[PDB]
From a paper:
Tripartite motif (TRIM) proteins constitute one of the largest subfamilies of the RING-type E3 ubiquitin ligases that play a role in diverse processes from homeostasis and immune response to viral restriction. The NHL domain, or so-called NHL repeats named after ncl-1, HT2A and lin-41, forms another protein module found in four TRIMs, including TRIM2, TRIM3, TRIM32 and TRIM71, that constitute the subclass VII. Here, high-resolution crystal structures of the NHL domains of three of the four human TRIM–NHL proteins, namely TRIM2, TRIM3 and TRIM71, are presented.
The NHL domains of TRIM2 and TRIM3 were highly expressed as a fusion protein with an N-terminal His6-GST tag in E. coli. Crystals of TRIM2 NHL were obtained within 1–2 d, while TRIM3 crystals grew within one week and TRIM71 crystals formed after approximately one month. The TRIM3 NHL structure was determined at 1.7 Å resolution from the tetragonal crystals that contained a single molecule in the asymmetric unit, whereas the monoclinic crystals of TRIM71 NHL diffracted to 2.2 Å resolution had an asymmetric unit consisting of two protein molecules. Nonetheless, an exception was noted when comparing TRIM2 and TRIM3 that were most similar with ∼82% sequence identity.
Author numbering: 469 to 744
Write the structure that this text describes.
Amino acid sequence: EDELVFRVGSRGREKGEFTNLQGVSAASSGRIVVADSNNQCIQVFSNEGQFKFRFGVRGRSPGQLQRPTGVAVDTNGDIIVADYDNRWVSIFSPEGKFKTKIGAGRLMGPKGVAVDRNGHIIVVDNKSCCVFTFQPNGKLVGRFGGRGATDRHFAGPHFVAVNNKNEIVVTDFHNHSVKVYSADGEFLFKFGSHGEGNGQFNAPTGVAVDSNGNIIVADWGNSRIQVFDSSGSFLSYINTSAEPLYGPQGLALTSDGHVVVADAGNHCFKAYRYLQ
């Protein structure tokens, strides 16, 4: 009878355990997909938290995972992994079969990924501080950003989401802000500032956008999740009181309308109801 619906995971390297849980995504087929950067693996669960399967071969060769940070699920259920250390994005089948890698030689530190409304793969690079837009096949179609603190630049972007207008929503871990851009890279607006007040951050991480354009943002340093309207107005905190967060990372919205968070500091993921 809590905003918390369920919790899955504990510390370790076995199936249903985590060392460094970072990326979170959801499939329309009603699955939850999580990446562990330190166990170098992807784990797939039902919408109720039941373990389905784990995949990932450790290493630096194509097909293999070295530091998988960011994950996204395509409309066909393909699993898209940002590998920060291999410096590419791996696309797998919904069953964990390597298909191809995109952005090799262009991405220097791919951290976060999303899928847009035309099936483009959106990658945020924490080393070049840029946002890349690819076709599934690997073809680059767009790039914007650059290191800095101006509205068109990023200081250290780790996560990305796309809204109903195909607009790109980037969290800036080091700037304490969220910035929103057109599909073409045009800056639209920013919100958030450094602090603990409503609509302030101490290092934003995961981000998701709902069907109503509400933007949901995890706050790593403040161990909390904020919900905003489409203009970046604070609406609420997710009520985490029953089982507090500790350093949350990825965020995703499921097909059954729950917010799932990588509660990395507690070695688990948690699913929430939220009222919008």
